[PDB]
Enzyme design. Structure first.
Site, mmCIF file in Angstrom:
data_model
loop_
_atom_site.group_PDB
_atom_site.id
_atom_site.type_symbol
_atom_site.label_atom_id
_atom_site.label_comp_id
_atom_site.label_asym_id
_atom_site.label_seq_id
_atom_site.Cartn_x
_atom_site.Cartn_y
_atom_site.Cartn_z
ATOM 1 N N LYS A 1 -5.943 -8.646 -8.861
ATOM 2 C CA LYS A 1 -4.721 -8.191 -9.521
ATOM 3 C C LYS A 1 -3.882 -9.375 -9.974
ATOM 4 O O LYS A 1 -3.363 -9.384 -11.096
ATOM 5 C CB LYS A 1 -3.915 -7.290 -8.573
ATOM 6 N N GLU B 1 -2.170 0.742 -13.807
ATOM 7 C CA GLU B 1 -3.076 1.581 -14.595
ATOM 8 C C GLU B 1 -2.556 3.002 -14.699
ATOM 9 O O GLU B 1 -2.524 3.593 -15.790
ATOM 10 C CB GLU B 1 -4.475 1.530 -14.014
ATOM 11 N N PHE C 1 5.156 4.612 -7.860
ATOM 12 C CA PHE C 1 5.405 4.902 -9.258
ATOM 13 C C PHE C 1 5.525 3.620 -10.080
ATOM 14 O O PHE C 1 6.186 3.606 -11.121
ATOM 15 C CB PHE C 1 6.607 5.828 -9.419
ATOM 16 N N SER D 1 1.104 8.342 -7.634
ATOM 17 C CA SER D 1 1.382 6.941 -7.305
ATOM 18 C C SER D 1 2.597 6.822 -6.355
ATOM 19 O O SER D 1 3.720 7.168 -6.740
ATOM 20 C CB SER D 1 1.636 6.150 -8.587
ATOM 21 N N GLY E 1 -7.723 6.206 -4.525
ATOM 22 C CA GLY E 1 -7.524 7.334 -3.622
ATOM 23 C C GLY E 1 -6.743 8.481 -4.235
ATOM 24 O O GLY E 1 -6.844 9.608 -3.755
#
Lengths: 555, 556
Positions: free
Chosen positions: A518, A216, A212, A209, A158
């Site tokens: 993940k 990636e 943060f 992000s 996104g």
């Protein structure tokens, strides 16, 4: 599951079982010269018109009434009001869902936990406006005194797709803005081939992000910072070339970013609904903040349409209901999005996330597994390109594929006295006409006779020339693809997705399905180092790793 | 239809109905420690290895045996021989199907109507080689004496997608080559935004069209020529800045391009199989003819693999058969192509044409309508981008979606001592592992308890955290994405598509399905001119036209 137990859904299914065979589009249009008027909406936004023509769908007045009654029975209106009132409709995460606040140009209060979010929204918008003015005007300078010529957005999902889609779509509005680049893949190709084209003295990186800590994005950000410092040397120079779309002040400051260049957003902004927030900074830098406000204003217009229009004439609701009809009654796995606009070449890809990550779900609100289909596979390419790639299968394969065809009436590039756009429009119109009408055996026989085919050659070729037709489409036609109109269109589909999720009784606003991959990738990472054979997984994962290790040092 | 009447297909269907419920990938891998070795293929091309790991598919030894028996019963090998021998297997058009001749580096004769095609194939290749050397070295000058810095391919469909996909995938090999641009859409945005970035003095246009009548391509070509002549004025300068790739010498000359500037191909080159021909000129200009020859050689290797390998060990055959299993037994509408490689970002889009235009068919060789599914909808984005867009649905939606995961072991960009590629590989491996294994209620409950969730919160969240798994994948891993390796991988999928079409008894090589939209657009085009209401179509087409006319005048 709630949907399967709903009496209005069961009525729809019974009608489908009893009447599917009367739904032939040729016969429907031949019997109702007024079909377009009955099955289309025209919206005047005051900044362009939108025609949503849903008449080439396998529906009758009774089907549409039954679909509207399903939306009522499933509580679409009450759920809409909960969203707009700031209630915690993202129930698995316990969060509000307020992308509509981001573009609430009226500034009517929207409370979360008793506190209006609009002052915080507008504070960040004001910060974005100031920063955009400084970068675009050349007031903001790099470490050697040069103005910014290139803006590089680093982010995934996104944080990437929306800004990319919008800056692609609004490219004509970018005179006076810096070039924009989007780096999202962890594949080192992506950052490496980008950096090779950039000058560190004139490049501004936006690290997108919330935490943060996204692996990636932060890895790409660290690679960019290492490249920048190889040129600049001075760590204090990072603050002239790196900003953050985040709320982790501590990590942003640690990275070398001035915390006054952190642009915040909130937990009720889902990533796939985030381009309207600080995440849209690259849009505002590229096309200017004024055009970003137009984009938000278009979305706001459509938010009001969704709120105030009777269900039976409400565009996102009808789009959603037609999709329910094809998914849950006809069983169609996919939905094609086909904008006849090269600037919209990333629109279908954006809605792959917005639609599939929202509604690719299987657990309902009560924790009960669905016993019906949920969200479709979304795909597509702009016309006319897709017409020369895969429309063969749409016309003459074995799959039913609902398609949305979109086009602006007015082109941004009216070259050759409009000739190119005239041809584009003719193809837009002809393809839906062809999908609806087909070409019968008798029609194809006549054509072959006229071409002078021998009886044997004619009978041999004839079946291959028949188009069964009856393939449904929506046509969405809008005056011009301006910032405002794009915002209205994106919001329309956002609310379509919302309505479908309410009907299915799923949470359109979480994404638990991303976690397992993940976790497993974190376990594999350390095992790739070294030459040791791996045995800790299933035989396929082990075999793949061991092949990777063998081929690592193949010349 | 032939497939439905085939006894081997019926046995496959019967087995599926009886045994479908026993196909659980966790249990299969738990019961067979040798599952990876029995359900994978390793190819050594001498220019890199390819591991086709099909072990995470819902198959057993018996399924694979039945599928190979189906390929034998449907005559796959005999059909393959017809294609390679130049027989007219494109039977609705009366044409040979000879993309394999374009890359026939062995030069063994291939006869069409009694004449070897290889001398003409090689004559055009030699012409390409000489032209590429002249353009890339600066020997070929524009109308003011400058060297060419930008090459613009104008074409659509088969004349666009291959060359674009390959030049994107082989970008590291383009040092010293001119920039390449692809203009394909009729939408005037495409050519307009491209021309605005170009200098007429240093730009070479390549007009690519099999028949040279495609409306989009000729319109775009005319717009480019008009722009070029506004600067150059002199019509003889066109011969220094425009070349053609086509089968139609007459239409190319009618357009006004020098006959010595035409690079020819043939009727038996399908557009969606044409990048190996003159259509690949923009590849050769961008990466050099030597790299284009390596691309051809990779395809030729895979052609020979396909021709000489027993079915049970033959990569395109096995990929084809796994697809038949998912399409005709499980009923999966789609096939996702997920290369973990940013350079391969247009690979899935290329096979949208290659697969869907080939096998999106419904009439068999005998003229009978199929009573079974044919080609799937192909889609995908490269990893990890697709992973953060739509994998939620692959893991926890309601759709079964066969996926091919592809990756090179060696990256073109080993930055940060290999850190990025290490992460990319870990995600490639983890995603197929996750799709296979899932996460049970018991496992998810244990995690929630260890994270300290209260009983109320645990029970509320628990079902949302379960992954049902059992979602099958292929993993295709190759040493490095070089020109040769890309050629081999593209040819592999070409042959997969061919095998499936033979099994379905359809013509993979025609495309009658594009005709009706073209005919109807030609009728609408003149109706859009002028302000009059249109009443000549169905009510929707009329109403759309009339809205367009109303809004054409609107001042936003």
């Amino acid at each position: 599951a709630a949907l399967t137990r709903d009496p209005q859904f069961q009525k729809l299914q019974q009608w489908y079982r009893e009447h599917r065979s009367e739904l032939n589009l040729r016969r429907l249009f031949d019997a109702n010269k007024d079909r377009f008027n009955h099955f289309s909406l025209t919206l005047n936004t005051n900044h362009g018109h939108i025609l949503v023509d849903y008449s080439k769908n396998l529906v009758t007045e009774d089907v549409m009434r039954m679909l509207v009654d399903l939306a009522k029975s499933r509580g679409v209106e009450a759920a809409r009001e909960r969203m707009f009132n700031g209630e915690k409709i993202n129930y698995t995460e316990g969060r509000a869902v307020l992308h509509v606040a981001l573009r609430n140009r009226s500034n009517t209060p929207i409370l979360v936990d008793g506190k209006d979010v609009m002052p915080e929204v507008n504070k960040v918008l004001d910060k974005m406006k100031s920063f955009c003015q400084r970068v675009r005007s050349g007031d903001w300078k790099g470490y050697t005194g040069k103005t910014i010529t290139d803006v590089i957005n680093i982010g995934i999902g996104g944080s990437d797709l929306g800004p990319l889609m919008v800056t692609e779509a609004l490219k004509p509005y970018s005179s006076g803005g810096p070039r924009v680049w989007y780096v999202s893949n962890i594949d080192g190709t992506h950052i490496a081939k980008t950096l090779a084209q950039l000058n560190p003295e004139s490049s501004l990186f936006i690290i997108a992000s919330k935490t943060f800590t996204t692996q990636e994005t932060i890895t790409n950000a660290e690679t960019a910072k290492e490249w920048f410092l190889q040129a600049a040397k001075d760590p204090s120079a990072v603050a002239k070339h790196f900003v953050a779309l985040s709320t982790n002040t501590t990590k942003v400051k640690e990275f070398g970013i001035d915390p006054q260049n952190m642009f915040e957003f909130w937990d009720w902004v889902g990533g796939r609904y985030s381009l309207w927030s600080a995440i849209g900074l690259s849009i505002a830098l590229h096309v200017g903040f004024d055009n970003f406000e137009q984009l938000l204003s278009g979305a706001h217009w459509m938010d009001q349409h969704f709120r105030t229009t009777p269900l039976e004439k409400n565009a996102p609701v009808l789009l959603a209901l037609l999709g329910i009809w094809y998914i849950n009654c006809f069983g169609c796995e996919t939905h094609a999005m086909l904008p006849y606009d090269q600037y919209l070449h990333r629109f279908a890809a954006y809605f792959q996330q917005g639609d599939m990550e929202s509604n690719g779900k299987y657990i309902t609100k009560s924790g009960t597994r669905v016993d019906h289909q949920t969200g479709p596979i979304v795909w597509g390419e702009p016309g006319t390109n897709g017409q020369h790639a895969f429309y063969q299968l749409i016309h003459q394969g074995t799959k039913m594929i609902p398609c949305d065809f979109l086009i602006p009436v007015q082109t941004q590039h009216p070259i050759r006295k409009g000739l190119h756009h005239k041809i584009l429009l003719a193809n837009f119109l002809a393809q839906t006409e062809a999908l609806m009408r087909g070409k019968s055996t008798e029609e194809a026989r006549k054509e072959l006779q006229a071409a002078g085919k021998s009886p044997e050659d004619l009978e041999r070729l004839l079946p291959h020339k028949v188009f069964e037709g009856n393939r449904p489409t929506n046509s969405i036609v809008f005056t011009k693809l301006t910032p405002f109109m794009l915002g209205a269109l994106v919001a329309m589909y956002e609310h379509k997705i919302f309505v479908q999720g309410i009907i299915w009784d799923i949470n359109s606003f979480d994404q638990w399905g991303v976690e397992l991959g993940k976790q497993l990738a974190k376990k594999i990472e350390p095992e790739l180092d070294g030459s040791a054979q791996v045995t800790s997984h299933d035989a396929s994962t082990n075999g793949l790793i061991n092949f990777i290790k063998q081929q690592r040092e193949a010349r």
